[model samples]
Target: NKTVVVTTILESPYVMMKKNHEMLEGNERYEGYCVDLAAEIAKHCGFKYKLTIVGDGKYGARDADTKIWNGMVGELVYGKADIAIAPLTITLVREEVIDFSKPFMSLGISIMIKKGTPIESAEDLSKQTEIAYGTLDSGSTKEFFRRSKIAVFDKMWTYMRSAEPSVFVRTTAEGVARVRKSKGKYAYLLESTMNEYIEQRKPCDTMKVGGNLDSKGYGIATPKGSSLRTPVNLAVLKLSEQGVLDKLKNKWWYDKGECGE
Candidate 1:
């Protein structure tokens, strides 16, 4: 059996590193939405895989200064990986370099903050200096603000680009920890799906507030001309049609929810 090298990031509910990961190897060291999806796809496509985390803990973004790609996108674009089953978005720049299957999930950028944050909306965050806010560095959310043409987002980018203490975070967990530690002073910008999932966990103090800043979908990715593309695509389509995708969402998000309905 040929081994497919799949790259993913450790974003909660999509891909997660195990608690006792030090003792685990390969796929055993991780679990969650993407892990289940990978197994399902492999079942349908008939291939063995070696699941690997992105060398750099990023969702994938191109650096402006060096003009080199990093994270899972870089791994796929440079042929270091054959498949990417994480929450990688389908963006024009990435599409020019790699291929994406039909969207497996739809989400939008949102503000994740503690329950009583003073900033109610992106507009509020854009105007306020008291409460510091930021998005995951090197990901689409950062890129969105960096290149935003809209007034509110452009204002946010101006603020973020020059925040004195550096608001940008290396990972979602780090950003969440920043918010938790600050008690209400820090806010994180991330996907609505993740924000919602985290809200249901034990420390339900954080909640998603305000409308989404933008809309997008996450898709499985493959290197250009990779042989697994068609079969993986078919598996996703089949799973959606059979409602397996929805079932999996409920299983992860609500069934194990720590917060009551």
Candidate 2:
């Protein structure tokens, strides 16, 4: 069988480092929805794989000055990896650079705040300066704010880009931690999927408020012209049709949820 080199990011229940990861070997060192999904994809596609974390810790972005890509997308773009199976979003720009499997999950941008925070919408944050807010630095959420034409979203980008004490975070966990520690003074903007998952976890005072800011879906990626694209796409569609993706969501997002109603 051919070997498929998989690139992914470590993002909670999607693809997490096992507790005994140090003692474990290879793919055994990790577990999560994507881990299981990877196994299933391999089984259906009939390939052996080795999972490796994206080296630069970015979802995928091109530097304006250098015109070079960095992150999971870069790895595939350069032929460093054969496929990517993380929470990578499918976007227009990326589609020009990489091939994507059909979305296995749907999600959207959202606001996350401490349970009692008075913030409800982007307008609420725009009208006030007392409550600091921002999103993870390099994902689609930041890109959405950066590229927004809406008045409220544009205003938010201005504030976040120049805030005196920078509200931006390196990861969703960091943003959530800041929201938890701000004591109602800070808000985190992120995917509603992650926001909902975190809200259902311990220290459950954090909540996702208002409607989602935008909608998108996460897809598995392969570099353009790769032979694996079609097979990966069909495998995902089959899993979705068989209810496996939904069942996996229940296992990781709800059954293992840590908070209460």
Q: What is the C-alpha RMSD of each candidate to the true structure, in Å?
A: 2.1, 1.9
Residues 1-261, model 2: lDDT tens digits: 568999999898898988888989999999999999999899898899999999988888888899898889899999999999999988988999999898999998899999999989978989998999998876778889889999999999999999878888877888899999999999999888888889889978899889988888999999888888999999999999999999999998999888860
Top candidate (TM-score): 2
User: If scored against the real structure, what TM-score would every candidate get?
Assistant: 0.96, 0.97
The TM-score of candidate 1 is 0.96
User: lDDT per residue, candidate 1, 50-166, as tens digits?
Assistant: 899898888788788998889899999888999999988888888888888999899899998888887778999988888999989888889889889999899999998999899
For model 2, the superposed segments whose C-alpha errors exceed 4 Å read: none
lDDT of every model, 2 decimals: 0.88, 0.90
lDDT, residue 92, model 1? 86
